[PDB]
Design a protein around this ligand. Sequence first.
Ligand code: HEM
Ligand code: HEM
Ligand SMILES: [Cl-]
Ligand SMILES: [Cl-]
Ligand code: NA
Ligand code: NA
Lengths: 713, 713
Amino acid sequence: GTSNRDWWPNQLDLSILHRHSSLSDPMGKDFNYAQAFEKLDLAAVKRDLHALMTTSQDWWPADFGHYGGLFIRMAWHSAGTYRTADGRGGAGEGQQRFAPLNSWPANANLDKARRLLWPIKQKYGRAISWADLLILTGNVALESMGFKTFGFAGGRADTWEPEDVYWGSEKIWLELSGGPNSRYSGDRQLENPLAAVQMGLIYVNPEGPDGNPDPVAAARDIRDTFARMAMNDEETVALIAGGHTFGKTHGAGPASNVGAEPEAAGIEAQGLGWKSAYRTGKGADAITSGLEVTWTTTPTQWSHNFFENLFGYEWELTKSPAGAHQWVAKGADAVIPDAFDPSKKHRPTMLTTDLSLRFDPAYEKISRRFHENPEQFADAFARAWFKLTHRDMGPRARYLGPEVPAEVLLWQDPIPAVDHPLIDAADAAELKAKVLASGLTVSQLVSTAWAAASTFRGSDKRGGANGARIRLAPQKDWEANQPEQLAAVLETLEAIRTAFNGAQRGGKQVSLADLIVLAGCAGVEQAAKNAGHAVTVPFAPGRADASQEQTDVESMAVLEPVADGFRNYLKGKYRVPAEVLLVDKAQLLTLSAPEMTVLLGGLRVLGANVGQSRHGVFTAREQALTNDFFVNLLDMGTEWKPTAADADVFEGRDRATGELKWTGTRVDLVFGSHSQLRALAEVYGSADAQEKFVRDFVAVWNKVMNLDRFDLA
Amino acid sequence: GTSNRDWWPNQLDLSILHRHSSLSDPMGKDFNYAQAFEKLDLAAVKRDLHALMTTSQDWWPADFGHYGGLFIRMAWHSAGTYRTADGRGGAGEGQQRFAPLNSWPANANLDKARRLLWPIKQKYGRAISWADLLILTGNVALESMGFKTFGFAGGRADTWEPEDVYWGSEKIWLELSGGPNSRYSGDRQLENPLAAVQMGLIYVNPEGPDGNPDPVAAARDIRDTFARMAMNDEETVALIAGGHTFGKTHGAGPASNVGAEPEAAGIEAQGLGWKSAYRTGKGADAITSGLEVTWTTTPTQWSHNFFENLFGYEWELTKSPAGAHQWVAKGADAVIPDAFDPSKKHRPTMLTTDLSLRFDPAYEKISRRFHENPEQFADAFARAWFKLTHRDMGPRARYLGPEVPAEVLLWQDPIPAVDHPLIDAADAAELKAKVLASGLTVSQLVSTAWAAASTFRGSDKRGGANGARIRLAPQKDWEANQPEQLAAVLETLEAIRTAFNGAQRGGKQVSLADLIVLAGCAGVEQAAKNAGHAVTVPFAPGRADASQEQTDVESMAVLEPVADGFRNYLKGKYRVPAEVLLVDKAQLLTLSAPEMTVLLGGLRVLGANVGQSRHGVFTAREQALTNDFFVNLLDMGTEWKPTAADADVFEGRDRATGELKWTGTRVDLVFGSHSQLRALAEVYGSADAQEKFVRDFVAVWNKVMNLDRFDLA
Ligand code: HEM
Ligand code: HEM
Ligand SMILES: [Cl-]
Ligand SMILES: [Cl-]
Ligand code: NA
Ligand code: NA
């Protein structure tokens, strides 16, 4: 059946914005997972999980009688898809159970892992999400095997369809670099936003880069991909050596014995895949990655044997029974237990990427430190495991349950607690009047509050206006934020704050974070008044100001907008057309297509464009909140053409005289070209739509101003 | 960006179920189009349309100074995509403005027509939908040119994204038949559910079949396609000759001068397409179809000149300036006006398909009667034009406005008015108790009500339980409906009805249509009580009983279910897997994925299967409303394998003993295989889900019972 995508494969896709509809969600539109989880008997769940560890099922028998390794890999892979560039992937939505991730090569036989969990899932029902369950199971695996975790939070709601994530352009699983859709160019530079070296891998290739078994070059891939997952050297070595203290790999026979991945399998497979024709197809005969490595002398118990082995032997290149490159300890005795036959032992073995931890000079220093000081290794791995599995959870306010660590961590972008009375409605009116009396314009007010709040992304729940990090490094210097203009606004607002706060008693004060948002709201009110309309913009106080020392500057860099169509901004020239970038930004902001439409048309007329650009400013009453953008954009009296200077800038001329009326970018004119966008534009550009436009704009404005407000959730 | 459809192109697609979300809809969730429309000043709209017909715009100058022909074609094409097989296509949702239809070759330059109506759309805003406006404009065109229409109804609500329709499997526009994705097999048999001869055409190829200019063979294609759009020979002749009384075709130069269709055009084209490099690219130089025919001596006035020409001349094969086959009148004078130069006249011309009306012997009889009796032609055309443009609107209750024709037409599947008081809540309770005391079983009651209500399709709003047409031909004899079992149930309910109606005072009575539905309600309550749950199923009275004489039996044929996965029924063997057919049915019933899931699981356990099949009956308490389908399907203790007899039937055996526990079909087991459906199944198969399951099943049941209740809208 030929589809629109087949006929026009490069047309913009709006379906990513209409995901997560109440249509596909089985739960009622009033279901609140947080509340369900808070009533869960978490202790009960953990006791059932501990039991499960050694309750071997015959359709996938437990290695060493203990599923803990398999479950730690499951949990690590759930979290391991995370990319800092967009915040997409990670464990927070349980996406491992949907396509494509349920069928990625690197996720082979994790289908078995999840199926082993169904009875517990079933027993507790909606009070524990799959998303939470996959992480909790990893934690209980660790504790069962003797490692004490740093903590655990619930609160990851399940999702009901696949997220639309860009995982790469290759059309072959696992394709090596340099092909027609290569994710690499130049000197092994991985294209943003990807965080894996091959399509269907988690970070890197366990045999080495494009399968070349060189631990030194593998290290480079490890460092790059782990950094793109928010992990530094110390955390990376802790994670890899900590993980590989447990369990084993599976490569008992040739890979050609393994059949269709789950999304490809027949209906009879009932959601499982990778059925193997090799011997019994499971247990002692399992084939997962094709490698056949067991790292330690006690694979079901926490130990210090990983680094004892890594440093205590020299390593020889060899092949598994499936033909994969791996390493065996020269001259060792058979000290490693077999997973199923007590009469068999094996020599110590390692992956290429394990050896990275010794042969890369920076990892080697850490690895040696961890070898000499195992309590430092344990603590580091505990903290990194917590980080890994909670990285995409958002502000600490979303953390649920009795095991949430009290320690505030820098990577959490912490917001101080509020310890004083908040402003009330009379205070908010007084502040808004002070802001309007200062001279700050509608454009400056809207611009600033937009800059502050629109850093939020729903993918990992980072960013937003809470924290007033816009006044700190690096946000205060981002080009999109207009640093010299922003400085002038902030100085004025900081002076209003100081003067208000100085006049109060009883402890009441206003945060700068709140005042930036309130000032934005005053701008939008003033803009409606310029248009002749009375309007009230909702405002909720309670943001606090974070410090520079609570703001990791390098971690904040990934939130910098290099494209923000809502301010007609593009930092440079990209392969991806700008209207694609606009929809991606709308998805991050959690906007529907109608919300994106109304918001952009109103920001254009309010003066929110970077640099005061006239592109898309289709109004003769700038700073007035009107539907002018849509009425003018849709006027057939104007003809558009690209400029000779720049194919991405368009001039709109009167069709009868030739005279120039407007200029616009691709982001502006896609609203008059895409047949779904134009249908939305028509609604707001109709003669009966002025009040609808204003009301819808205020609602979306407020939505954006509250995106990170999980303290009100 | 590689997608799940790329990796697994044959996996089932659930996205068709979650179209029409409130996410993509810009109107508020309380917007009611009927209420907006009823206050429109329709007369004012029609005056503006009248004025528009002769107000030429220079970017697409009006032929003969009059847009009427263009607008008639626009409206004809809006309606003309309708297929009786599934009810999809048609004018009722305004889909011509979206992909793919907006860029079908047969829709070339209708982009211009729609753009001409923006100023009126803009003026009246949400009070007139685009869907309604396209058809209204065709009517105003006709009236302006001296044709008296049969009437007009408003009430087609706009849609905001493309419908997912199967339009064919060709990957090339206009591909001739006999290609690798040919829609023809055997002796020119067009595959169901298609209703056009080539991808991107409305009915037939105006040059002749696959371009062969033979009017006799063209007539075969005309008859077959028009029959598949619910039109008989008289209506077909009347429509084609009626339409081609007006206007002209456009083929002034070679087709290679025509550029990209709207969906492929540059952003600067602002949603228009087919920009032509031929001379001025428009007006006298226009190219649309490539044919260059003007049918009558007065292209802007109703006449009987089409048949005067068709029959008054002999015809010669010729070529347009674009190279297309067309016909010209042998030895004629230049009597046809030129569209822009009053000093030029042309000989009469015809398409191959126009000549069909004379050279096919059955058409010729009708055409000659219409020639001799033009008043009969005008009445036929007016009736056909109303049917064409309203065929997908649904019951007469949805018809809005002051121009609705009072004559009730047979193709409307009309329902008689109710002229008596309705039963009240106590009456309904008394009747449910009478039904349960009769000895009718849960299975009989559920199955009968299902059979009655589940004929509805939201594509054209035909079917449903209103009418009690289940007791009439042909419904009473459909295989799916289990004719002998059904007859026994109906006899018992008719006796209950008679006894209740006979006891009343005051004119109160219950229709059989209502009692079928209510009795199904009693069955579902009784099933719930069998499971230990007291529930009340909602019921709304007001259905009426239609007569056999008010039921067109041949039109009702297309509503027969040949696949109904909700009753585990497949009338024969199809190319399309049964699960795909299930999702198609769910879409026709307007069900979401969660609604389809709950509905199916509950019907299985209530005994709704055709023929009392055990397939999918995963319960040991049949006729009790429980979640047993889901709990048993999802039990990893059971292993499934296709049977040697039949690859589409599966046995479920205990994994340990081999013992046979169940059998199922693809429709049953897809809920354990597809990753999104299994996630839905898991929610209802959880230990906490019994109350939820009941509540949700009752809700979806009542939704189905009420699909055709636009009297309560
Ligand atoms: C450079 C990064 C890493 C690479 C290339 C890698 C590679 C792999 C491979 C290929 C397997 C074998 C899959 C099989 O055949 O069953 C595996 C097993 C596993 N990995 Fe990793 N790993 C990485 C980092 C991690 C991390 C960060 C963790 C957790 C903190 C982890 C924990 C595990 C464990 C527990 C297993 C054993 C599975 C079982 O016993 O069934 N690894 N690893
Ligand atoms: C066998 C069925 C049909 C065939 C093959 C067909 C073919 C076409 C073609 C090829 C054109 C020219 C497009 C252009 O170049 O501008 C057209 C024009 C037109 N058709 Fe049809 N037609 C059919 C039925 C109908 C029907 C049922 C109606 C309405 C009742 C209709 C009304 C018109 C009108 C009014 C025009 C003139 C458009 C203008 O003046 O711009 N046609 N026909
Ligand atoms: Cl994601
Ligand atoms: Cl449709
Ligand atoms: Na994420
Ligand atoms: Na339809």
